[PDB]
Design a protein around this motif. Structure first.
Motif, PDB file in Angstrom:
ATOM      1  N   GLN A  21       0.879  -1.173  -0.051  1.00 11.79           N
ATOM      2  CA  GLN A  21       0.134   0.090  -0.142  1.00 11.79           C
ATOM      3  C   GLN A  21       0.928   1.281   0.176  1.00 11.79           C
ATOM      4  O   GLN A  21       2.088   1.153   0.251  1.00 11.79           O
ATOM      5  N   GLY A  22       0.216   2.424  -0.418  1.00 10.04           N
ATOM      6  CA  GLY A  22       0.845   3.985  -0.330  1.00 10.04           C
ATOM      7  C   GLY A  22       1.261   4.212  -1.726  1.00 10.04           C
ATOM      8  O   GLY A  22       1.211   3.577  -2.715  1.00 10.04           O
ATOM      9  N   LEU A  94      12.397   8.679   1.615  1.00  5.30           N
ATOM     10  CA  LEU A  94      11.288   8.513   0.813  1.00  5.30           C
ATOM     11  C   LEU A  94       9.952   7.984   1.655  1.00  5.30           C
ATOM     12  O   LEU A  94      10.361   6.875   2.131  1.00  5.30           O
ATOM     13  N   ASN A  95       9.080   8.891   1.747  1.00  8.85           N
ATOM     14  CA  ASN A  95       7.675   8.295   2.336  1.00  8.85           C
ATOM     15  C   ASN A  95       6.626   7.830   1.447  1.00  8.85           C
ATOM     16  O   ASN A  95       6.653   7.921   0.248  1.00  8.85           O
ATOM     17  N   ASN A 123      -2.298   9.741   4.639  1.00 11.54           N
ATOM     18  CA  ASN A 123      -1.620   9.443   6.084  1.00 11.54           C
ATOM     19  C   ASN A 123      -0.122   9.029   5.433  1.00 11.54           C
ATOM     20  O   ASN A 123       0.125   7.873   4.895  1.00 11.54           O
ATOM     21  N   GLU A 124       0.638  10.017   5.646  1.00 14.45           N
ATOM     22  CA  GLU A 124       2.170   9.953   5.586  1.00 14.45           C
ATOM     23  C   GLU A 124       2.991   8.913   6.456  1.00 14.45           C
ATOM     24  O   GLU A 124       3.048   9.352   7.820  1.00 14.45           O
ATOM     25  N   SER A 125       3.549   7.864   6.018  1.00 15.51           N
ATOM     26  CA  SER A 125       4.440   7.007   7.009  1.00 15.51           C
ATOM     27  C   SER A 125       5.589   6.704   6.295  1.00 15.51           C
ATOM     28  O   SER A 125       5.896   6.715   4.846  1.00 15.51           O
ATOM     29  N   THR A 126       6.493   6.122   7.072  1.00 17.25           N
ATOM     30  CA  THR A 126       7.586   5.361   6.537  1.00 17.25           C
ATOM     31  C   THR A 126       7.172   3.957   5.791  1.00 17.25           C
ATOM     32  O   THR A 126       6.462   3.037   6.292  1.00 17.25           O
ATOM     33  N   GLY A 131       1.046   0.020   7.664  1.00 15.43           N
ATOM     34  CA  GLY A 131       0.404  -0.649   6.680  1.00 15.43           C
ATOM     35  C   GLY A 131       0.909  -0.202   5.087  1.00 15.43           C
ATOM     36  O   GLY A 131       0.614  -0.592   4.260  1.00 15.43           O
ATOM     37  N   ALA A 132       2.025   0.810   5.020  1.00 17.95           N
ATOM     38  CA  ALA A 132       2.735   1.047   4.047  1.00 17.95           C
ATOM     39  C   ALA A 132       3.403   0.167   3.604  1.00 17.95           C
ATOM     40  O   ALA A 132       4.123  -0.583   4.241  1.00 17.95           O
TER      41      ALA A 132
END
Length: 145
Positions: A21-22, A94-95, A123-126, A131-132
């Motif tokens: 995901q992402g 890099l997110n 929803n910005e995540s590593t 879930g990314a």
């Protein structure tokens, strides 16, 4: 979720496929934010990391002019190699941005999408957390999803 495409290996350092995901976050020519799975990266005329369409990744990542190569790890760490230097130099992160409803994202062309009311807030995540998905340099996500 959204439909994952199959990862084919190209061994091109410019190619960074997402496994899971992402979306990569980029800045449009008018200052607003957009999102894409097209991990085909580049360096613009001022050393900024951009995508294949020429859009600056957000937040900005600067590649030193003397960088020999760019490595993007599975966790999104961006590092470069420099001549005669043994250790890699990290230059940015890099997110990956996730959405509640990827179907609600509005296509703006060129494989870019923007946040809508139907998509939900970004929803910005590593890469790898919350879930990314993970980043695979040298791989492309095939459209035969």
């Amino acid at each position: 979720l959204h439909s994952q495409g199959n990862l084919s290996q190209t061994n091109n350092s410019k190619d960074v496929a997402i496994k899971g995901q992402g979306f990569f976050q980029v800045m449009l020519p008018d200052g607003t934010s957009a999102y894409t799975r097209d991990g085909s990266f580049q360096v613009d005329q001022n050393g900024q990391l951009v995508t294949a369409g020429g859009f600056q990744v957000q937040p900005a990542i600067t590649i030193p002019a003397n960088a020999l190569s760019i490595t993007i790890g599975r966790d999104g760490v961006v590092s470069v190699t420099q001549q005669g230097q043994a250790a890699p130099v990290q230059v940015g992160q890099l997110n990956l941005t996730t959405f509640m409803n990827d179907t609600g994202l509005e296509s703006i062309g060129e494989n870019l999408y923007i946040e809508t009311q139907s998509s939900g807030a970004p929803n910005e995540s590593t890469p790898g957390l919350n879930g990314a998905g993970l980043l695979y340099q040298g791989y492309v996500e095939t459209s035969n999803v």
